[PDB]
Design a binder for this molecule. Sequence first.
Ligand SMILES: [Zn+2]
Ligand SMILES: [Zn+2]
Ligand SMILES: [Zn+2]
Ligand SMILES: [Zn+2]
Ligand SMILES: [Zn+2]
Lengths: 302, 371, 196, 112, 21, 383
Amino acid sequence: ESPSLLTVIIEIAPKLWTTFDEEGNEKGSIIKVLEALIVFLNAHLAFNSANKVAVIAAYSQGIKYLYPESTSALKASRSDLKIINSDMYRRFRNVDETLVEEIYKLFELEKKQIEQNSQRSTLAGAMSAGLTYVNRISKESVTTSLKSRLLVLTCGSGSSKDEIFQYIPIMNCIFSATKMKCPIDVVKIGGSKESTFLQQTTDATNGVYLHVESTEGLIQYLATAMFIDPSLRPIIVKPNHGSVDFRTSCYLTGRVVAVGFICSVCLCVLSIIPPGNKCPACDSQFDEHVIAKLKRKPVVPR
Amino acid sequence: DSLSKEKLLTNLKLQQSLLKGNKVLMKVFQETVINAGLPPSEFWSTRIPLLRAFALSTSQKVGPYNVLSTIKPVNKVNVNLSREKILNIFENYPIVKKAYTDNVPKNFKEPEFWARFFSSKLFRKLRGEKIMQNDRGDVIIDRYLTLDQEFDRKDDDMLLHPVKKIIDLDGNIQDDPVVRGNRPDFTMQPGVDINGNSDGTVDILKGMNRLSEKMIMALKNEYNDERNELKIDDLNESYKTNYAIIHLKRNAHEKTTLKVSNQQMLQQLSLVMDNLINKLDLNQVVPNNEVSNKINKRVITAIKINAKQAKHNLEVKSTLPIDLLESCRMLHTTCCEFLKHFYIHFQSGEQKQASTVKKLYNHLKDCIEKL
Amino acid sequence: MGILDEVWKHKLILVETPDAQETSLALETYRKACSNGRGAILLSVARGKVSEGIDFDHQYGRTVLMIGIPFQYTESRILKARLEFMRENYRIRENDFLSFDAMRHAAQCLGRVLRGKDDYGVMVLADRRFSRKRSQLPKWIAQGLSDADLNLSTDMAISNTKQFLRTMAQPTDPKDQEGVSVWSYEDLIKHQNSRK
Amino acid sequence: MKFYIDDLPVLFPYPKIYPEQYNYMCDIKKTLDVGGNSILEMPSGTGKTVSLLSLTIAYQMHYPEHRKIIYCSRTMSEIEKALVELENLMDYRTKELGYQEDFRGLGLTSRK
Amino acid sequence: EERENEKTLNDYYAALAKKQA
Amino acid sequence: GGYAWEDEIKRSWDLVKVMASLVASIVEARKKRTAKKNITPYQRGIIRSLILTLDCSEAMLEKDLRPNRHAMIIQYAIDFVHEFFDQNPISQMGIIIMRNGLAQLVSQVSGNPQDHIDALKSIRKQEPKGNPSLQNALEMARGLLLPVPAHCTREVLIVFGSLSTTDPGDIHQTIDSLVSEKIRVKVLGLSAQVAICKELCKATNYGDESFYKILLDETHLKELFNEAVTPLPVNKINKGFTLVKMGFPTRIFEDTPTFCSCHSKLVYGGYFCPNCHSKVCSLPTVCPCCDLMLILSTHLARSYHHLMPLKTFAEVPTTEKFRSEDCFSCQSRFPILKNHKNGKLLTSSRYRCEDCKQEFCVDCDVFIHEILHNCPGCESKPV
Ligand SMILES: [Zn+2]
Ligand SMILES: [Zn+2]
Ligand SMILES: [Zn+2]
Ligand SMILES: [Zn+2]
Ligand SMILES: [Zn+2]
């Protein structure tokens, strides 16, 4: 009916995938997830003649657009490497060859810059870049009624824990995708069953959350549950089991918050009254009169 | 004033009128306050804004205006007199209300009184129209005319007051006390008749000035400055914003309830490199029809769970009869009201009202028994 | 005829009484009515007591409706004798001096409305004879009076007044007025250095 | 502010001054140096009274002649307005100089 | 019919006025 | 002594007389970009209690606004309610109209936008009439904002259409009372600058005269309505920094309908209160059983971007060597950018960020200023 844009945010990190390879029995799961993604993109391009594909990779030192290529790089180029066979459909072949060429270049960049270990994950910035590209394809409006859908292929592998710095950018991406009606599906490959921020991303933006433990048979997961086109979103139910509670972590203790208190200035969530009667985030001094009422013990006769 | 919470709580007539107006709040009141023994002050404690809104819906009044200027005819001519127009006539013109009190309950009815007043010279005088002797007026109303003039005199008795020297026009002509210049011509003087007496057109000017002064002075109720007036605010410094600025620290605590070396990292990367060099056989993505069964079972079970949850989600129709459903609804409503009062008194933190907390706990136990 | 009845629906009417005390009460009532947003109209003589000394700045002004040119009574003997005296001695034409006096009274009543450059008010002149007397206006008033406004009708004047009132209801740009309409001390020092 | 016109220090009681006010003070000071009659159409809206008062008080106190000042207006209300502006000006002068100098300013009207 | 309902509310007004006074 | 018809023909055809036009557009764009340079992390009151006062007078029957004034104000108030509850979920709002000299409260102060939408739709049918009363509306709003807690800011938005108001009492006493109750009033006027509205805004906003806004055309009214959804920056003298107690409920799942604690109706889903285990229909609302605020993490997340707003991106110099030929966020190729014949790469569409120094096009620049609120380059930086 209506063509859509599939923007793929893949989180390829050499430290993250090595942990998954060490935890799993098999090695080189990057190749498996890449070929599953390639078959899924060929499937999406087969769905409609006018659909478009965006692929952005988040590596350790930054982000880079896998597909389409940079316009400076496109003008500079074309060495047709034989990673993908040339006898297939040309529309699939161009996308696949461009994707594997940019995988080659990005892994050469990672090998060159392997000495520096980054403690800052760039998945949220990659999602923001994908949202900008989605707005560009909508704003450009070359094609009538292009729709859109983000698909984030991330890996936790039981090594990367919850990242509290990502919270505000992921929430901003949620609000942006809700504004532009872009569903966000998330595939997580790793031993961490629960990813609270990404589950909130799937739940709030009418996306599908899917956690898997083995990279084998991944195209069976993608072509079945992640193939929900934006044209057929309301008429197809979503298999995103394990509903998220939409809670948040405390600021000074870190635990998931029950009934609690927040700062009226900076909205930071506190599970308990902070010491010194001052906000730990924005350094606002609290009135001692009002916090005594919060500290006031409930009443019952003797 | 009357808008304080203790005044709203003790205003029994206002609560009765709010009950009389409302219907959905009646079902909560009648089944809890008397049928379940809830104190009436406790019931209206949580509905203070509703009581304030109902009080302010009728307590407010319109501003003063020239009501007689709006009154105009339309042979038969008809004019419509609303009750609010009558009240505005009484407020703006106390002389008419004085004639209303001693005539309408005594001699003739109210529409006859208003028809006599509209055909009288008093209406023409109070409307600013010039008075002529050819009009008959009305002999009952016109008896007040001279008294009305006395009222006008008494109007000056609370209108004349000393003013500031900035707008002291009296002192401007009295700055030179012995001035004896040329007398101004008749264009600069009020008009006179053939006999030299005034034509009365100056009286209607004083009439409308008096009306404006009375409407302004009616706002003055319970409902060094020359330096500030003469200062040029444009030449002063522009206003500077004193808005507070905040710097937010992002050093939050991590969430609480096998590091790879760079050598094996590079070996795995090079393994991916050589696996990308030789052949990326996409046909390897096909499952061996065994793991695909497990994937299909997992996906179909998740779909079944989500579809059974989202099969069903103005209230929805119930299988219960309308007689039993309304009884369950009202009992749920009074249980929720008792629970709200109990939690308010429990989390208020005042030890002096702990007996009310005990009474609400007994009421909650009675609600458990009723359930 | 009931023109004033429609005026009462919007603004209160206050008229300059010949008594200076009642006129002072009317003037302070006008000032009170402009402050609280009730709105008021103040009718006065262009050669009267309110015309001299009393200022109408900001909300007290905002519109000076001139009903005709304030000419003196020509048939008065004193005015004719003075006109003959000025024609005999100072060679001043009688019509020229009459127009001069009338336009200077009109000019003072138009100038009563402004205090500060942030203040605004329209200056409407409702007579056919004002059009030939543009050169007899003050120089600063004459710069503001465009040539297209010399023969306006009622409706065109109303539309221009509405556009003007909508226009300055916006906040002005300080950068457009930082050193051209008002000067700080540094701007004054720079201008003094530019003058030498 | 405080600014100098030739050798005359002028204490203006506002932090900003209109250009027309400064040109007005320049013309008045030139006239006072000449010492003759003059006619100056200072436009309304701008600070006609405050500029006159500030420059004439600055001329009176600074110059050794210390010439007295007569201010004749047309209405008593304008006399009071000029007195208020003069009070503000000398309050500013007292604030800037740190002391209240030997000064006398009075308005004259009838007994009424 | 709401007429019997408002009659019962009027009777309840009478009962509440009798009890509160 | 002549006639108008005897004059020469107007000859309006002969009066008609027939690059760097992109430069002429981009200087105005740079003036638009210059007005956005005042980026400061000013403290703003997130929890708001907004009272929208809409005029419903005879001056609302004026047809200078298409198609009449009253219908457009109601529709833009509907859009304003939608935008305000989209951007300020925790904030509550009530609607008051001024009609026939009386303040009519048409929707109580509540966090549910649907009730306010229904109230505005009901008011849209009725015909405006009467002489408006600012004092009655201010007193009604003062009565409404009295039970508002100290942490929740008290704001009133008055869409005033008329030029004069009739009050039953002294409006200056009402202004002083509103100042004493820390209630901030912003007035959008339709015809001209009314002095009492300017005085009220200046007194309530601690001397700030910028809170009295008057439109110019249709889109200016849209921009003024969209400006009021942002929280007002609070003064330094305000010391109401109190901790606010709320719980985060869990979305209960059940195939059996249950009576909600707020409306006593049969709803399948709901949110059980973490404090007292009572269910509600929608969020964010107070708990009807224990008077506790019930919000989600997203409701707090919607107002974080006001607390850390992004610095506006800087226009790159023409002579400066560009990092990338294409965009960074959306990899759009920056064009030849030759506004005139020898323009070269003049006013290059790259917008350099102040931290990551990445290049963004004008589309990405206006997209981050409107929909997103985070710079992708600042997150891609390995800090
Ligand atoms: Zn804080
Ligand atoms: Zn409910
Ligand atoms: Zn609760
Ligand atoms: Zn871009
Ligand atoms: Zn940046």
